Design a protein around this ligand. Structure first.
Ligand SMILES: [K+]
Ligand SMILES: [Mg+2]
Ligand SMILES: [Mg+2]
Ligand SMILES: [Mg+2]
Ligand SMILES: [Mg+2]
Ligand SMILES: [Mg+2]
Ligand SMILES: [Mg+2]
Ligand SMILES: [Mg+2]
Ligand SMILES: [Mg+2]
Ligand SMILES: [Zn+2]
Lengths: 81, 206, 153, 60, 128, 114, 96
RNA sequence: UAGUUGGGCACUCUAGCGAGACUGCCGGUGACAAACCGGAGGAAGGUGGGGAUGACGUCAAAUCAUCAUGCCCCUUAUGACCUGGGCUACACACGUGCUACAAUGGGAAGUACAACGAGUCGCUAGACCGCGAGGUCAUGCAAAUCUCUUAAAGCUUCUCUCAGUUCGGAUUGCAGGCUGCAACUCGCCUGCAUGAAGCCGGAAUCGCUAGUAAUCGCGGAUCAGCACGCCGCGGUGAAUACGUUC
RNA sequence: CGAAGAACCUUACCAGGUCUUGACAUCCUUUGACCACUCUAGAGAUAGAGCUUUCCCGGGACAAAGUGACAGGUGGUG
C-alpha cells in the first residue's frame, strides 16, 4: 500500500507461514495470492505462486522484501518471433 | 433512409409525455415501477383493446389512466375485474393505486389496435394485403385524413425477406403540427417474426 | 466558387497611424488570434525604423510594398499532355496580399533573434531593393516575361 | 452467458467495487445513466415513446 | 445629475452604460479604461462613435460590464454608447446607422456538433 | 572543476550546475540558498570561497559516481533476483506497465521493419 | 413563506402558479408574483445506432422550469389553503 | 471589509406572454408573369446564423452480442459457482490524437475578463500541516442563496539571447500521496534525479469560406479510482474565394 | 468503433478447483419456516458444526427436498 498503512498481505498466508515456525524449507506452501507483499519471515522459504496456469516455485531471499509475489511469477511466455 | 420516431419527434410540441409525474431521488424507482406496471398490464389484458397508458404520482399514490376500446371487458360485470387488477398492482408497487378507464372512440384510428388486429390476422395466416387494405378502409371511413402501413418479414413463408405496405391520403411526417400517431406491433409466426408499422394522420393542432 | 464572386468584410484601420495596410499586416503576422503580440511586434519594429531612419515608418513601408508588389502572376493551365504557366495581370488587392505574404514569410525566415528585428531589417532591405522578397518579385516577373508568349491565353 | 450475470448483480457483492451498473431492462451493461438505470438503447426507445418524463428532442 | 443610459451587447458580454457631461474619461467597473482594456487597439474601437459625431470632449462615461472577454466587452461598450447617443440626440442616428453601430453584431459562437471534433472542423478522412 | 566536470562559464550558476549528473534546478537553488549567494551570477565572476562552499555542499550531497553506482546496483539487483521489473531491462522493454505494441521506441532503440 | 415550484412544462407550471396566487389573494395576503428562476437543462447524447456507428448521434434534453412565490401576510386561512390544495403530478412543490 | 445593510427594480438578468421580417415597401430589369438587382427603414433582408428535421429505395452494407426471434446445435455440459490469469503481449505495419522540435518563445512575479454544467453521504469554504500530490478540524449547500469556480491564453515587469539550449519532455531510479479487500502483471497524481528522440518532416495526403479556421482553457456522462478520447461551453481571433482550364 | 471507464467484478476467453430441474423461472407432493450471524477450515466456491426455525393472515411468497415437465447458452445462421 502506497499510503503509509498496513503493508498488505493475506490472512491465510500469514497464518500458515506463522504456523510454520521452525522454518523448515520442506514445508513448501502454495498460494493464488500474487498481490501480497514479502516480509522477513518469508525470507528463506520456497513458495509456489499461481501464475494463471501453474504453481511456479520461487525461493525467497533478502532482496525481495519490498516486492510482491506476482513479480516472480510472470504470465506471458514470450520467446521472440 | 432511417426515420425518427414520430411520437418522439413531437413530444412537447404536440404531445405530452405519457408518464406524467415528477421526482428526483426516487426517479428511477418510479420509472422502473411504471415499466413493470406496463409489462404486467400488457401481459394480462392482451385480449382487451388496450391502447394508451398514463401514470401520475401523488405522495404514495399511483393514479393510472387506461384508454381501451372494450372498457366493459376490462371493468368486468359492474366491476369485479379492476379490483383484482389494482390488488395485483398494489402487490407489485407496494403502494396504493387508483385507476380511470377511458372509452376509446374511433378505435380504428388508433395506431396500436390496428397493428394488434393486423398482427393477429397474420398469425392466423390471413393475406397481408387483405389485412392492410381492410384496416385502411376502416380508418379512412372512421374519419382519418390519411394512413400508411408497412409489413416486413417472411411474408407467406418466403425464402427472402421484404417489406410491403400501402397508403391512402397523407402522412406528412416532416410536418410537426400533425397529431400523427405511430405504432409498432410484432407477429410471431412459425417462419419467424413480422413487423407491422402503422402511422395515422388525424386532424392537427393550430 | 460556382456562384460568382464574394464581397469581403471591410478592413479596420490602425489606431495610431490610421492605416489599413498596418492592420492587415497585423492580421498576417498574427498566429492563433494574438492581435496584441502582433501589434506590439509591429509598433516596436516601426520604432526601430524611426530610430535608424528619419523617414516615416509608414512611408518606408509604402515604398517597400511598391518594391515588392508584383504586377504579373504566373497561373497554371493544364493543356492535355503538358501543364504550363500563363502570365496574368494581377488585381490590385492580390498585389498587396502577395506583398505582405512575401515580406512576412521571408522576414520570419531571416535568422535574427526577434521577429521585431527580422521584420524591420526585411522592410528596410525591401525599400532599398535588396531583400529576399524582392528576389521573389524578380523571380515571378522573370517567369512572366519568359512565358510572355501566352499573352493570347 | 446471461441472466446469471443479472443474478450476480442482484445478489450481494463481496466488495464495494464488485457492484456494477446494469440496464434493468436489457442488461447491456455498458452505456448506463445513473439517473435512469437504463442503457442508451432502451433510453432512446422509451424517450421516443414518451415513457421517460421530461426528456425530448434537443436543438439549440 | 443628467444621465443618458444605454445597454450594449456583443459576444456573450453586456455593458450597462451611462453618459454624463464631462471631458472624455471612461470608467469601467471602478477602474480606468486604459487599465481595464490594456490594448490600445480597442479603446479606439470604443471611441469610434465620438469620432463619427463630434462628441469627444463632451461626455465622461460610466460603465458596468459583465460577461465575455476584453474585446467582446469593448464591442459591447461601443454598441451601448451608440444607443445612448440616440437618447442624447436622434439626429446622430443618420451617421451611426451608416457606421453600423446600431447594428448589433450577431457574430456569436457556433455549436459544437457530434461526429465533428469542433463546430465546422472534422476529423481527418482517410480514403483507405 | 567541481566533481570531475568542467562546467560552462557564460552560463549562470544554477543552470550551469544543472550539467552535473545528480543536480537539477531545485537542488541547485536549495544549495545556493543554503550557502547564501546570488543565483543570477555567472560562474566566471565568482570568488573561489563561494566555489569552495559550493563544492563542500555538493560533496555533502550524492552526485555523479555514487549516483550511478546506486542506480545501477538497484537495476542489477532487480535483474539478478529475476523480477518482472528487471526482466524488462534485460529484454530492452519499458518498465512502468506501458504498452509495447505501437510505441516503446525509447527502449527498443531503432526500428527494424521486417 | 417561500414556495419553490418546479416542473417540466411551463404551460402547466404557469397555470398552477396562477392557482396559488389566486388562492393567496382569496385568503387575503400579499404575495410576490410567481418569479421565474433559471431553467436547468440536463443534456444527454446517445449513439443514434445500436452497434459501431459512432459519428451519428442524438441529443436528448431534460429541461426543468421553476417558479418562486412569496407569501408576506400569512393568514391561517392562507397557510391552511396552501397546504390543503393539491396539484397535478407534473409540477412539484416545496414550502419553506 | 465586501450589494454590504436599508431601500428600489430603474438598467441587467431570469422566463412566460407577445411584437418583429413578410420582397412587406421605393425604383430598375423581366412574357404585363414568377423572379432577380440595388435602395430605404429596421436589431436583423431576402431559407438572418445554426440545429432537430434524412423521400422511393441501393449497398443480400452492419447488427442473432442491447433486445426479441424461426431453424440447427450442447443439456453430468457450448450451461452454472470461485480463485488467479488474459482482453494491457511485441520483430513489425497502418489510422485517429497529444506533446514537441522554440524567442510570435521558456522560466519567476503581479494582475484582468467567461459560459455551459454537476453536487448528499456528494460539492466543500475557511483555518492548520506538508516542497507537492494531498491529510486533520470544521462551516454552508438537496442549491440563481454554498461549493466545484480568482479559468487559461491575455496584460505589465524581470530574466533567459540562439544553443539539442534554462528547448523538448520521453524513458528510467528513489521517495510519497489518493482510490479502493487489493495498484506485480495492470491504475492516476506529485517531488527529487536522469534528460532520449526531435532543429518543421519524402512519395503523397486531410480539414476549413466567419466568430470560421487556428489557438486557449472550463465543465459534464461513464466513474470507488483512472481518458491525450467523447459530449458541450465560452475566451482571443485571421487569410482567401480571380474563376471552372483541369 | 460496440467500450459513456479491461486491477477483482465487468469478462463474453484461458488454467485449476467444483455443481447438475440447476446461478435465473412457472406447474407440482412440506406433517412447513428459514434467511442472516459466529467459529473450523479453506484461494475461494464450498462443506462441518453451533447461534437459530420466529414463516405471516384454510389462505398468503418464501425454505427444503422430491417430481419431471423444463430452465439455461454473449453457441451458430444479420
Ligand atoms: K472522473
Ligand atoms: Mg471555440
Ligand atoms: Mg497503461
Ligand atoms: Mg424542412
Ligand atoms: Mg459480418
Ligand atoms: Mg481492447
Ligand atoms: Mg522546460
Ligand atoms: Mg460552405
Ligand atoms: Mg478480469
Ligand atoms: Zn436496455
Amino acid at each position: 500500500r502506497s499510503l503509509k498503512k498496513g503493508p498488505f498481505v493475506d490472512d491465510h498466508l500469514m497464518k500458515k507461514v506463522e504456523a510454520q515456525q521452525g522454518a523448515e524449507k520442506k514445508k513448501v506452501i502454495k498460494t493464488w495470492s500474487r498481490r501480497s507483499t514479502i516480509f522477513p519471515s518469508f525470507v528463506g522459504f520456497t513458495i509456489a505462486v499461481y501464475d494463471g496456469r501453474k504453481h511456479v516455485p520461487v525461493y525467497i531471499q533478502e532482496d525481495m522484501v519490498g516486492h510482491k509475489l506476482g513479480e516472480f511469477a510472470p504470465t506471458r511466455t514470450y520467446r521472440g518471433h | 433512409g432511417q426515420k425518427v420516431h414520430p411520437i418522439g419527434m413531437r413530444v412537447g410540441i404536440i404531445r405530452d409525455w405519457d408518464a406524467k409525474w415528477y421526482a428526483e431521488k426516487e426517479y428511477a424507482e418510479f420509472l422502473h415501477e411504471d415499466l413493470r406496471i406496463r409489462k404486467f398490464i400488457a401481459t394480462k389484458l392482451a385480449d382487451a383493446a388496450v391502447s394508451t397508458i398514463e401514470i401520475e404520482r401523488a405522495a404514495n399514490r399511483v393514479n393510472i389512466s387506461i384508454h381501451t376500446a372494450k372498457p366493459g371487458m376490462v371493468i368486468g360485470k359492474g366491476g369485479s375485474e379492476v379490483e383484482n387488477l389494482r390488488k395485483e398492482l398494489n402487490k407489485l408497487t407496494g403502494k396504493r393505486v387508483h385507476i380511470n378507464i377511458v372509452e376509446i372512440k374511433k378505435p380504428d384510428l388508433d395506431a396500436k389496435l390496428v397493428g394488434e388486429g393486423i398482427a393477429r390476422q397474420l398469425e392466423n395466416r390471413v393475406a397481408f394485403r387483405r389485412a392492410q387494405k381492410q384496416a385502411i378502409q376502416r380508418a379512412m371511413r372512421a374519419g382519418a385524413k390519411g394512413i400508411k402501413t408497412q409489413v416486413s418479414g417472411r411474408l407467406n413463408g418466403a425464402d427472402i425477406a421484404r417489406s410491403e405496405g400501402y397508403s391512402e391520403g397523407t402522412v406528412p411526417l416532416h410536418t410537426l403540427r400533425a397529431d400523427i400517431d405511430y405504432a409498432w406491433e410484432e407477429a410471431d409466426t412459425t417462419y419467424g417474426k413480422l413487423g407491422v408499422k402503422v402511422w395515422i394522420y388525424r386532424g392537427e393542432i393550430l | 466558387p460556382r456562384k460568382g464572386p464574394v464581397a469581403k468584410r471591410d478592413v479596420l484601420p490602425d489606431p495610431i497611424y490610421n492605416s489599413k495596410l498596418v492592420t492587415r499586416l497585423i492580421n498576417r503576422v498574427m498566429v492563433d488570434g494574438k492581435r496584441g503580440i502582433a501589434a506590439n511586434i509591429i509598433y516596436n519594429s516601426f520604432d526601430i525604423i524611426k530610430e535608424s531612419t528619419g523617414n516615416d515608418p509608414l512611408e518606408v513601408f509604402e515604398q517597400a510594398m511598391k518594391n515588392v508588389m508584383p504586377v504579373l502572376e504566373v497561373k497554371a493551365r493544364r493543356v492535355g499532355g503538358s501543364n504550363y504557366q500563363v502570365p496574368v495581370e494581377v488585381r490590385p488587392e492580390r498585389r498587396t496580399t502577395l506583398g505582405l505574404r512575401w515580406v512576412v514569410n521571408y522576414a520570419r525566415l531571416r535568422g535574427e533573434h526577434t521577429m521585431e528585428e527580422r521584420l524591420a531589417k526585411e522592410i528596410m532591405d525591401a525599400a532599398n531593393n535588396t531583400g529576399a522578397s524582392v528576389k521573389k518579385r524578380e523571380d515571378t516577373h522573370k517567369m512572366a516575361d519568359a512565358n510572355r508568349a501566352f499573352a493570347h491565353y | 452467458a446471461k441472466k446469471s450475470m443479472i443474478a450476480k448483480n442482484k445478489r450481494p457483492a463481496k466488495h464495494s467495487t464488485q457492484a456494477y451498473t446494469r440496464c434493468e431492462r436489457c442488461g447491456r451493461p455498458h452505456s448506463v445513466y445513473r439517473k435512469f438505470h437504463l442503457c442508451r438503447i432502451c433510453f432512446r426507445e422509451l424517450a421516443y415513446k414518451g415513457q421517460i418524463p421530461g426528456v425530448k428532442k434537443a436543438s439549440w | 445629475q443628467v444621465q443618458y443610459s444605454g445597454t450594449g451587447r456583443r459576444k456573450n458580454a453586456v455593458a450597462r452604460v451611462r453618459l454624463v457631461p464631462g471631458t472624455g474619461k471612461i470608467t469601467v467597473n471602478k477602474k480606468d479604461v486604459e487599465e481595464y482594456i490594456p490594448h490600445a487597439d480597442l479603446r479606439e474601437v470604443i471611441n469610434q462613435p465620438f469620432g463619427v459625431t463630434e462628441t469627444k470632449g463632451a461626455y465622461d462615461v460610466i460603465v458596468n460590464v459583465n460577461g465575455g472577454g476584453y474585446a467582446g466587452q469593448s464591442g459591447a461598450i461601443r454598441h451601448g454608447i451608440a444607443r445612448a447617443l440616440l437618447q442624447v440626440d436622434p439626429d446622430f442616428r443618420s451617421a451611426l446607422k451608416r457606421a453600423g453601430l446600431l447594428t448589433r453584431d450577431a457574430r456569436m459562437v457556433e455549436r459544437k456538433k457530434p461526429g465533428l471534433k469542433k463546430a465546422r472542423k472534422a476529423s481527418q478522412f482517410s480514403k483507405r | 572543476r567541481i566533481a570531475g566536470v568542467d562546467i560552462p562559464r557564460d552560463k549562470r550558476v544554477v543552470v550551469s550546475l544543472t550539467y552535473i549528473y545528480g543536480i537539477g534546478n531545485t537542488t541547485a537553488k536549495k544549495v545556493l540558498a543554503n550557502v547564501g549567494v546570488s543565483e543570477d551570477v555567472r560562474v566566471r565572476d565568482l570568488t573561489n570561497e563561494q566555489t569552495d562552499a559550493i563544492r563542500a555542499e555538493i560533496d555533502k550531497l550524492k552526485v555523479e559516481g555514487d549516483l550511478r553506482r546506486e542506480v545501477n546496483l538497484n537495476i542489477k539487483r532487480l535483474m539478478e533476483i529475476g523480477s518482472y521489473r528487471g526482466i524488462r531491462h534485460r529484454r530492452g522493454l519499458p518498465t512502468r506497465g506501458q504498452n509495447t505494441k505501437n510505441n516503446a521506441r525509447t527502449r527498443k532503440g531503432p526500428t527494424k521493419t521486417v | 413563506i417561500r414556495i419553490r415550484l418546479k416542473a417540466y412544462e411551463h404551460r402547466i407550471l404557469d397555470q398552477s402558479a396562477d392557482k396559488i396566487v389566486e388562492t393567496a389573494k382569496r385568503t387575503g395576503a400579499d404575495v410576490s408574483g410567481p418569479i421565474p428562476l433559471p431553467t436547468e437543462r440536463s443534456l444527454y447524447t446517445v449513439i443514434r445506432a445500436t452497434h459501431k456507428y459512432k459519428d451519428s448521434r442524438e441529443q436528448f434534453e431534460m429541461r426543468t422550469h421553476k417558479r418562486l412565490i412569496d407569501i408576506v401576510n400569512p393568514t391561517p386561512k392562507t397557510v391552511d389553503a396552501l397546504m390543503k390544495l393539491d396539484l397535478p403530478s407534473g409540477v412539484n412543490i416545496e414550502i419553506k
